[PDB]
Amino acid sequence: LRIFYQFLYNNNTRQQTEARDDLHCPWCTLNCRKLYSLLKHLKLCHSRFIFNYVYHPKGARIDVSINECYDGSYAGNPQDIHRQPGFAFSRNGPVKRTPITHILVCRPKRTKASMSEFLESED
Amino acid sequence: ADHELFLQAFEKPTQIYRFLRTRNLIAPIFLHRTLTYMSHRNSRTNIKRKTFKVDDMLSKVEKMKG
Amino acid sequence: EDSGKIKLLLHWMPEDILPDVWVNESERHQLKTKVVHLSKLPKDTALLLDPNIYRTMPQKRLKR
């Protein structure tokens, strides 16, 4: 199978499209097999931007768009990190203990996933 | 047209991912085989039982002189 | 509605560009080869000498 891209910037501007060498991640050079695997790799591991497809006439097409939102923030001590003034303790300063407010984030509970990776082949 | 702005945009997310490519190939975050959608990889199945393990096939008679 | 502020600071980005260019010059991981240079693993321990940061600590001075 071939693979093509299409770079959407503001919906009607330059594409300078593409047609890859292989079925690998053009970014990370991973070697998937299917289109399913590819698209999941692509939406998850590189989600600074956003990925559509007809998949092709001849099993190949992708469309790309620079993400608006992304939530490309800092995850850490929300205090003493995001605003400690630019001294040697600015962004990180994990040199010693600090407090945080007691937070709590439960990322998955217990997953409901079908054998099929097609769901993404359907969506 | 202005390609300049387009480039200035797509250049930020690329540089990152290139950098991460060259790391995670060496020092991975997680594995690309321990994963649902990359079920492709990992030609293996969780099978063998082992504990009495010492095979000690260590003949290795090589020494020096001088 | 709301965007947010990217943590990657455009003062890091130059020090992504520069070492990337040092690399594509030296070890030519883009042009002379594939995007994967060698398979990249077989060396194991001195792979951290290109760049400065394939892996550095959070901290070099530590309690324990």
Binding site: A19 | L7, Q15 | -
Partner: peptide, 27 residues
């Protein structure tokens, strides 16, 4: 269409030695 993903590999290397046709005549 033409122009393989080396496109990406001229966005990081625009200047200072990016080479050969595709990487220079990208856009």
């Amino acid at each position: 269409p033409a122009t393989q993903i080396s496109d990406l590999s001229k966005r990081k290397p625009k200047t200072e030695d990016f080479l050969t046709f595709l990487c220079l005549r990208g856009s």
